[model samples]
Target: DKIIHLTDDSFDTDVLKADGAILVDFWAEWCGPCKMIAPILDEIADDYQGKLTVAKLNIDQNPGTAPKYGIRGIPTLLLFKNGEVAATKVGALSKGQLKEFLDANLA
Candidate 1:
């Protein structure tokens, strides 16, 4: 419910220059694997509501972004801290795996 839809227009100002931690999911509409883990992202969004910002950027719609981040695959997740990518995860992962990923990165 708290997921933020990011785009090329707003990404720089909203994410690249934001405060605290932000997780950007570079996904596409045709990515079946992306849909599979959508719920996991939702839970992360809800759990970290105020502590972090969970966002999504559709690669098809926002073309320039994926290339800049070298996103060669769907469901690529990049965690940004302050103004840089702190960590990156590719493909679908279990909810438990993601929980630990977030804990390690945002800790």
Candidate 2:
């Protein structure tokens, strides 16, 4: 499985009204840690397919959507299910961190 990228234009339809939970990573081009997280994230995206719908949203391009959540960080992780937020985290994390995060959030 691959990560679904989201834009401000499609953010609502692609994520808000989506059928299941989403691990939407809020990141940007200038950020350093986010680049590192990409590979690790994709691995989990494949490993946790169906169980967790992983996606990425660039804050720079989608300036409008970021304010909705009021997230002040670039590498923020927002978990949503049924169009509502399930969890939120900021900074980089490992596969174990993600897997461990979902163990509770997905329940």
Candidate 3:
């Protein structure tokens, strides 16, 4: 499945109140590093579909949620479980690294 597009309008319902694990990518269009992770995240979203709800929030568009989550940089990844943060990684990651992160948390 495609990563869900999250905006300021949908932040509360999609991320904060979401059921199960929600992996959120906080990014901005102009950030080169953010662009690099887009395709990898898309693939991961598909690979981990039913196991987790993957979503991306454009920092440029959804400023409210970013600040609420204390996002200070682009390409911040927050893994939420049971409606709260379970793990967080800030920065770029290769596909393998992302997989490892998910794998560790999945079981």
Error of 3 at 27 (Å): 0.3
Quote each prediction's TM-score: 0.95, 0.94, 0.93
Q: Which candidate is the best by lDDT?
A: 1
Number of clashing pairs, model 2? 0
The sequence of per-residue lDDT tens digits that candidate 2 reaches over residues 1-107 is 47888999888897889999889999998999888788988898889887878899998887888889998977999999978999987998888887888888889
Which segments of model 3 are wrong by more than 4 Å? none
In angstroms, the error of model 1 at 73 is: 1.0
lDDT value, residue 23 of candidate 3: 93
Compare the candidates by TM-score and give the number of the best one. Answer: 1
* Superposition TM-score, candidate 3 onto the true structure: 0.93
Q: What is the C-alpha lDDT of each candidate?
A: 0.90, 0.87, 0.88
